[PDB]
Scaffold this active site. Sequence first.
Site, PDB file in Angstrom:
ATOM      1  N   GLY A  81      -0.993   3.407  -2.080  1.00 40.03           N
ATOM      2  CA  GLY A  81      -2.219   3.914  -2.657  1.00 40.03           C
ATOM      3  C   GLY A  81      -3.273   2.828  -2.635  1.00 40.03           C
ATOM      4  O   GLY A  81      -3.343   2.058  -1.672  1.00 40.03           O
ATOM      5  N   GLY A  82      -4.099   2.746  -3.674  1.00 43.39           N
ATOM      6  CA  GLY A  82      -4.987   1.611  -3.797  1.00 43.39           C
ATOM      7  C   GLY A  82      -5.953   1.478  -2.640  1.00 43.39           C
ATOM      8  O   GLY A  82      -6.959   2.190  -2.574  1.00 43.39           O
ATOM      9  N   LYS A  83      -5.665   0.526  -1.750  1.00 41.75           N
ATOM     10  CA  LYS A  83      -6.547   0.248  -0.620  1.00 41.75           C
ATOM     11  C   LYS A  83      -6.832   1.504   0.194  1.00 41.75           C
ATOM     12  O   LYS A  83      -7.944   1.683   0.700  1.00 41.75           O
ATOM     13  CB  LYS A  83      -5.923  -0.827   0.269  1.00 41.75           C
ATOM     14  CG  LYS A  83      -5.532  -2.091  -0.475  1.00 41.75           C
ATOM     15  CD  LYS A  83      -5.060  -3.174   0.474  1.00 41.75           C
ATOM     16  CE  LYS A  83      -4.448  -4.341  -0.280  1.00 41.75           C
ATOM     17  NZ  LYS A  83      -3.242  -3.939  -1.057  1.00 41.75           N
ATOM     18  N   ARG A 106       7.039   6.500   0.010  1.00 42.19           N
ATOM     19  CA  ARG A 106       5.678   6.014  -0.185  1.00 42.19           C
ATOM     20  C   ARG A 106       4.661   6.919   0.495  1.00 42.19           C
ATOM     21  O   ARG A 106       3.532   7.046   0.013  1.00 42.19           O
ATOM     22  CB  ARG A 106       5.554   4.579   0.322  1.00 42.19           C
ATOM     23  CG  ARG A 106       6.725   3.698  -0.075  1.00 42.19           C
ATOM     24  CD  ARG A 106       6.328   2.239  -0.205  1.00 42.19           C
ATOM     25  NE  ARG A 106       5.605   1.968  -1.443  1.00 42.19           N
ATOM     26  CZ  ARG A 106       5.030   0.809  -1.734  1.00 42.19           C
ATOM     27  NH1 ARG A 106       5.058  -0.210  -0.891  1.00 42.19           N
ATOM     28  NH2 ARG A 106       4.417   0.666  -2.906  1.00 42.19           N
ATOM     29  N   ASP A 115       6.759   3.946  12.385  1.00 44.49           N
ATOM     30  CA  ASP A 115       6.842   2.494  12.317  1.00 44.49           C
ATOM     31  C   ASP A 115       5.574   1.860  12.874  1.00 44.49           C
ATOM     32  O   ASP A 115       5.107   2.228  13.957  1.00 44.49           O
ATOM     33  CB  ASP A 115       8.064   1.997  13.088  1.00 44.49           C
ATOM     34  CG  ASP A 115       8.177   0.487  13.085  1.00 44.49           C
ATOM     35  OD1 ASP A 115       7.563  -0.156  12.210  1.00 44.49           O
ATOM     36  OD2 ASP A 115       8.884  -0.059  13.958  1.00 44.49           O
ATOM     37  N   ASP A 156      -1.342  -4.140   5.596  1.00 48.10           N
ATOM     38  CA  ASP A 156      -0.775  -4.635   4.343  1.00 48.10           C
ATOM     39  C   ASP A 156       0.738  -4.648   4.521  1.00 48.10           C
ATOM     40  O   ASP A 156       1.439  -3.712   4.133  1.00 48.10           O
ATOM     41  CB  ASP A 156      -1.203  -3.768   3.165  1.00 48.10           C
ATOM     42  CG  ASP A 156      -0.713  -4.308   1.839  1.00 48.10           C
ATOM     43  OD1 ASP A 156      -0.510  -5.537   1.736  1.00 48.10           O
ATOM     44  OD2 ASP A 156      -0.525  -3.507   0.899  1.00 48.10           O
ATOM     45  N   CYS A 188       0.666  -9.275  -0.847  1.00 46.18           N
ATOM     46  CA  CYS A 188       0.764  -9.443  -2.298  1.00 46.18           C
ATOM     47  C   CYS A 188       1.731 -10.562  -2.662  1.00 46.18           C
ATOM     48  O   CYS A 188       2.647 -10.373  -3.460  1.00 46.18           O
ATOM     49  CB  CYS A 188       1.184  -8.131  -2.949  1.00 46.18           C
ATOM     50  SG  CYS A 188       0.177  -6.709  -2.474  1.00 46.18           S
TER      51      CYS A 188
END
Lengths: 246, 120, 109, 338
Positions: free
Chosen positions: D139-141, D163, D191, D209, D264
């Site tokens: 999510g997020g970005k 996810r 992938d 990410d 992260c």
Amino acid sequence: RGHKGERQRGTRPRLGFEGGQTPFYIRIPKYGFNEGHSFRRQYKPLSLNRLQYLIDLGRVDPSQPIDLTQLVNGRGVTIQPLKRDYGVQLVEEGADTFTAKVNIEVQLASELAIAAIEKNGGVVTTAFYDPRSLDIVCKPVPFFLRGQPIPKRMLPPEELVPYYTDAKNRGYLADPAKFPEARLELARKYGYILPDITKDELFKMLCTRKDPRQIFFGLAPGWVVNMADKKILKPTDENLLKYYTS
Amino acid sequence: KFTRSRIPEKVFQASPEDHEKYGGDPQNPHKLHIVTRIKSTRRRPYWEKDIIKMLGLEKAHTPQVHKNIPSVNAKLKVVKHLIRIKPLKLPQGLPAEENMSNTCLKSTGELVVQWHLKPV
Amino acid sequence: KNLGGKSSGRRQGIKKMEGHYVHAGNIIATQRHFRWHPGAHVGVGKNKCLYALEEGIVRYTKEVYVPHPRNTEAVDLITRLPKGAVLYKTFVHVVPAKPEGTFKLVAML
Amino acid sequence: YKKKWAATEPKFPAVRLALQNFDMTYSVQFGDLWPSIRVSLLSEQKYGALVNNFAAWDHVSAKLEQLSAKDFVNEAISHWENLRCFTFDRGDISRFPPARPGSLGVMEYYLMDAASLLPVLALGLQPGDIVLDLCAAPGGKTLALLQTGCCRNLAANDLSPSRIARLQKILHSYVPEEIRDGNQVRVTSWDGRKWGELEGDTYDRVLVDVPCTTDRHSLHEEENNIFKRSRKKERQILPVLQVQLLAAGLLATKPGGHVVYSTCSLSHLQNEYVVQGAIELLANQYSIQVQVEDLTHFRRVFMDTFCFFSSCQVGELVIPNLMANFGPMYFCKMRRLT
RNA sequence: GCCUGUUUACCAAAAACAUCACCUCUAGCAUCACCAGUAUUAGAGGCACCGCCUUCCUUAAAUAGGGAUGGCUCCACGAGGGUUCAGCUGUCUCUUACUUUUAACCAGUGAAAUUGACCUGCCCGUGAAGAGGCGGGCAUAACACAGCAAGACGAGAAGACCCUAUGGAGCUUUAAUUUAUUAAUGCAAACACCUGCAUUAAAAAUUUCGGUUGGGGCGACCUCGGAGCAGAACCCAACCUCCGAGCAGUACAUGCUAAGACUUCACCAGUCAAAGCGAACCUCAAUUGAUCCAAUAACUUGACCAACGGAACAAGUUACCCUAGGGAUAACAGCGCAAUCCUAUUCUAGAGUCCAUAUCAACAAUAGGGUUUACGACCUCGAUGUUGGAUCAGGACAUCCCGAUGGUGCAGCCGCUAUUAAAGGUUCGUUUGUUCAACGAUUAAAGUCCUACGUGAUCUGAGUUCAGACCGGAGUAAUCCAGGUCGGUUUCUAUCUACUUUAAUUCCUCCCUGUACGAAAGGACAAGAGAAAUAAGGCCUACUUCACAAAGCGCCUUCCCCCGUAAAUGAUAUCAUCUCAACUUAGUAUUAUACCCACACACCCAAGAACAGGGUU
RNA sequence: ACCCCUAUACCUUCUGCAUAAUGAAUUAACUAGAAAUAACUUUGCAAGGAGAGCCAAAGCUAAGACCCCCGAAACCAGACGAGCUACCUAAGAACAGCUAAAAGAGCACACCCGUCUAUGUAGCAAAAUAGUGGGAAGAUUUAUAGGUAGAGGCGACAAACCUACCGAGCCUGGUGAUAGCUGGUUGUCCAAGAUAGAAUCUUAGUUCAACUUUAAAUUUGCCCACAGAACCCAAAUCCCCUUGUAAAUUUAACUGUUAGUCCAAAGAGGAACAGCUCUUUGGACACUAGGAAAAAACCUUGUAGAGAGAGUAAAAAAUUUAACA
Ligand SMILES: Nc1nc2c(ncn2[C@@H]2O[C@H](COP(=O)(O)OP(=O)(O)OP(=O)(O)O)[C@@H](O)[C@H]2O)c(=O)[nH]1
Ligand SMILES: [Mg+2]
Ligand SMILES: [Mg+2]
Ligand SMILES: [Mg+2]
Ligand SMILES: [Mg+2]
Ligand SMILES: [Mg+2]
Ligand SMILES: [Mg+2]
Ligand SMILES: [Mg+2]
Ligand SMILES: [Mg+2]
Ligand SMILES: [Mg+2]
Ligand SMILES: [Mg+2]
Ligand SMILES: [Mg+2]
Ligand SMILES: [Mg+2]
Ligand SMILES: [Mg+2]
Ligand SMILES: [Mg+2]
Ligand SMILES: [Mg+2]
Ligand SMILES: [Mg+2]
Ligand SMILES: [Mg+2]
Ligand SMILES: [Mg+2]
Ligand SMILES: [Mg+2]
Ligand SMILES: [Mg+2]
Ligand SMILES: [Mg+2]
Ligand SMILES: [Mg+2]
Ligand SMILES: [Mg+2]
Ligand SMILES: [Mg+2]
Ligand SMILES: [Mg+2]
Ligand SMILES: [Mg+2]
Ligand SMILES: [Mg+2]
Ligand SMILES: [Mg+2]
Ligand SMILES: [Mg+2]
Ligand SMILES: [Mg+2]
Ligand SMILES: [Mg+2]
Ligand SMILES: [Mg+2]
Ligand SMILES: [Mg+2]
Ligand SMILES: [Mg+2]
Ligand SMILES: [Mg+2]
Ligand SMILES: [Mg+2]
Ligand SMILES: [Mg+2]
Ligand SMILES: [Mg+2]
């Protein structure tokens, strides 16, 4: 016995065990299928076919009032008070071929059975019996050998009171004034002319009905039947007389 | 896996050489087979065992007469490797009621309607 | 490191082959995706199972496939076909056996 | 099997194993900053409220401002010489009220780490840019990109169907179905490494990410901790997988297109060596040249809200501080020159 | 380890326990211990006296030994454990003689384990996988007596070790359940004690310690779905290959009812659904959970019961262990297999200064072996530990030496390599259980293997294996350990089979001869002689142990081949050719012989267990 | 009589045993299937049956028929045990000789102990003998009586000892404990008769299913001609009229078998090894005989007796190789 294992050793698990899987007779939810089964009232069916057959073979005499005692004596029905049998219920089966004029007393009666009985000129009354009075009625001779005074017939339980006070059911506690109206309604519904039994030569026998607190036709509560010497002892004490009349 | 065997149809199409070799005429084919079980059904599939039982060839070396019709032929094709099939020859035609009790099946495949057991 | 994959077979497929007499409501064939399409007097359940809507004989045929116009993916697939091409699919039909009733003399008024 | 062993290795919680590793590595990496980073990581995380542009953005921004949160993105744009994420002042520990659906039927705002928004801001989505999110599927970005003006479609890929499902649910909750219906959003469960072959020289903007040690989540959550012994193989091979994913993204991006590699984690190995190895592998095996963009102006602009590890060679590293518990977040911008 | 002492009675006497001394904690006190005591006392506990502080040597050879608050400190002592000088000695080189016991025979008395029946052989093969019993060969009158221990997977404890059981039991716990019991308090009751109820501890009590996988770990998995395996109706495992789910979104008729069908191989559960009433005019892989029981007026809701057909609530450890079984299940061993291992050929890459093939050898290919490390779980868990060593050795040759040949980068000597040959031999010491290995000294050589990694009813137990105890480490603890160390019960009287008296080899020295060969330095064969050593067989004249004799350390005798090739003549193919051509030599095994040869009481004996044998002139 | 030819004791446990897996020396005696429910057969009576109760939509009454033995370690209750041993209490006894002097001293008798070796190992001995050895005036040894008793005692902790076998004594009782484990389970004869799986604190077991047996009902069972069964991306199978056949389904009752083997074939894992491990189709084996040497699994062949007849089935390995201009 097989070869080894629990079955040959004689120690296989209990019946209903499934080898540890939750047994079938336990994985099914409990439901009230048999709740209060021992308290549900049971009434032996008495089809009009059976009644006519008994009358024809003479095991039941229609010239006299027909009650549970007479039915049992004629072996037309078997009653098991210990098994919560509360009496006999009239069953319409055989109504279309019933041609006997009888004065029959039962515990329950179908509308069609009442209609057939009345069309043939007879009279039907639904009378309640407590388990003890019912046992006495079904087997009076053993009761007389017990050496006890004839007890009072207990009133119907509150739930059954409306049934035996309703005239449409010919309840033995119902208002006799409403009986002609109910009989006329049945006659009109089932398309037969109501026979005026008052003109019948057997009108007295048809009208005979035991008192609600009475078990046998001619015997009052409190009397003692000495069968050995063919006598009946009647209490004279005022307290006993009041109790047995109440 | 081992399974039922489907025989290609060309196997059961006789050639003129076969006709000459075996002495049969494609026209006017023989009516009845004489079938004998010359092989054990043991160590053979249960379906071959069942076909043998259906054809009635439980006993070996015991001739049995069967119709020469396509269904019986299909069964005989299923169990062809356990049996010997020959035509039934009737030099004196099929036996009559009079001589029904004097018949005999020659080893040549001929059903003789008279069997006197006397020198020719 | 490979887990799962122990699911048993669904026992799907054809329950009534061609020529079998089938009563109304009987399931003809169960499929995970549309191997056989419903034909005449054959209904489709939620899980794409084919059941007989009438009592009759089951027949399997091959018929041209013209999907509903609202079926966007099938319509696009067709739109991409050449002019001469016509799609075909296997359909299952139930040839009803009995008539749906007969007129009987009830009363000679 | 051998039941009775001589000495069994002590049973450590994965959180404590991660603490051991982070100590023995980041202490050396950061010197005197490691105490502060450790306390910030072990303390509560500071959240930012990204207002859903699709919803009543003005009303939600007003409500947050009344809650005394200010738009760090807005103040950054103020001195830079379309996103709105409100955060509390330095030192404040106040929590944003849980986001709730708005009148339009979409959630008013998303509570996400503010540092996670910096990669998207640095990506600089030009009006109508074709975008790729190679593996970013928490999510997020992704939501930030969609709220940005990448109307030329965005392909969000991940290798984890769980996810992917989470992404789909957040998209249902936030992004209108009218926006999501077209090819504007394509969510895939493939992938990223294969993505170079699947598409090449296609996307103008790419966000990679890569999976990483996710230091804060490793330190907090016991479940599915990367530092558990069973996942030692995955932990060891992580750098190679990250290099492969970044190489795939660089192959996918159009010549002259921009990519942002995000992580992260604090690990120099997982960030700077990963980007450098990706550049080298791309320039050798595939003979494509990538120039690392300078994000120092980005650092200065966003310094007021985030504390940055000044001693960084390539890219930027938001480090978690107690005054601003927004990190960790490494992001490196790379323009594919050839 | 301070010391004297104590301990597993019946496998451990110790470094373990105790011990003076020192230290920690608890207690201010009397009429049954402590104690007829009172802080210099008493109890519980730790630790261990006292005192002090803060690569070289050894041997020839050396896996041995010695030296370069706690921590040091060996004075003394020790059946403790190692090392050692010198002496000592049969421990040994290397065994012998004698006495007693035992033994064997005669006489009396007279057991035990054991035992399916036995009319109880050897070789090879086979086989529930190592056969007296089966197949093919061979052998084969009958029985006693005395020895032997290779086999009868020998006899002894339903052995030792390992695994299993919804078997026990001991112990520890932050396993579950309790506080019935005591000790405290608090509240009641009574006017401190007693009783009732609570709370907290101590102390205990009951019970459990899931399953499938993983030998060099620090775990994985357990339910549901899709795909391949499983190609085409259905069904199909895996400690097989991959991929996923424990939701979400919509709607609120996602209402009620009902024929007929499907069904995950049972059941449970799960699916589809015509028609009808009433209304309008759910999707897709899985996305889950039974009964009971709780909450609820009802409708309904409730476990990540995921060990996912679900005990309502229970973990570790056991080598102190026990029971019932398992060769269905491990380790030694046997038996399969040949991945690994070894050997030999094919190919010539390449080395060998040039040269594939004197010699070595890459990629590979083909065979052979069953000596390594593994894999398999087929016999044996209803008394066989195992590794080394001692003793005796049988066998293969893929030969370490000795013998015979070919080639050579073979002048000779040394060698290297290949063919043939298994008759004979193939050492002793230091460390260390150690096989092995290193080292010392030799040898002609100190060969590779198989034989239940030969042999333990022939021996040993040094490592390793139970109970004891230390160091290091893991563990809260009980305890544990592929680690280091000290100690630690090795029974059997032999019934059967089998067996119990069957022409040497080598080294060195001399001669040939410091000759051949060589430029020299070096330095040969063959043949002959002499010395020894070992091995076999004998003997006591000496010497020696000893003494009418037995022995070695003493003496005496020891005798023939084996064949790989090198040649002659000569065709097939008129040359040539050593010939699975006829043929001629080296070329012989057809061991040559030697030994033994008399059918006929008692005493003595160099003959001997008995029996037998020899002498009695 | 032997000689000739044929013949691999039995029981049990096993996929499979002469097996060198268990048990058995042998004779005699003793020694191990106890029962309801619902069924079936045979009667009686019959819409009623039964000698109160109970059952009843042909039921009911009565009878016949059906379910083993031995074995744990264990647990608990109450007794009995400190004449052995652990420790203690009372009041006793012993300790030569020498050296040193007042000693938990030294050497060394008696005495106590039991280091090492050998013997013995059903022995002299259910722990001994010989030698050797430690202590031997002390924390010593020891006679007598008493005491501590088992979820306890005592213990210089060795989990030592508590009447020869103590991680918890012994006896009696509960107790015929329990045992999914081992073993055993005794007259004759005939007949049918062998393995799809699921669930399970479950894989040494059991319930269901499958298979199997018995009895009954009625009617199709098998073999199988066309026709028919999918796209994505081979062998065959299913369905199936005829035909050859005679079996099938259903009803009632009930056990038992559900730790398998090898061969052919298609695969998977291993190493395109295993007499290796799994799944699928078929065969054989667990059942007779003949053959391949002996031979569970390969080939021939089966339904069963006597014959001093006969025809056949499968059934015996093959091969010997290099001249050359
Ligand atoms: N259906 C259902 N029954 C439950 C659930 N939780 C508990 N029960 C009932 O309670 C039993 C389990 O008892 P517990 O494990 O003590 O339940 P708990 O809720 O964890 O704890 P308590 O409330 O203390 O009993 C189950 O077997 C049921 O009888 C649930 O989620 N669903
Ligand atoms: Mg048995
Ligand atoms: Mg599958
Ligand atoms: Mg000492
Ligand atoms: Mg001492
Ligand atoms: Mg002892
Ligand atoms: Mg003692
Ligand atoms: Mg001892
Ligand atoms: Mg030594
Ligand atoms: Mg004698
Ligand atoms: Mg043999
Ligand atoms: Mg003898
Ligand atoms: Mg034998
Ligand atoms: Mg045993
Ligand atoms: Mg089913
Ligand atoms: Mg389960
Ligand atoms: Mg121990
Ligand atoms: Mg096996
Ligand atoms: Mg040789
Ligand atoms: Mg071996
Ligand atoms: Mg030892
Ligand atoms: Mg050790
Ligand atoms: Mg030792
Ligand atoms: Mg000792
Ligand atoms: Mg011995
Ligand atoms: Mg002996
Ligand atoms: Mg035997
Ligand atoms: Mg056994
Ligand atoms: Mg025996
Ligand atoms: Mg005493
Ligand atoms: Mg003295
Ligand atoms: Mg003394
Ligand atoms: Mg003592
Ligand atoms: Mg101890
Ligand atoms: Mg101990
Ligand atoms: Mg005792
Ligand atoms: Mg028992
Ligand atoms: Mg039979
Ligand atoms: Mg369970």
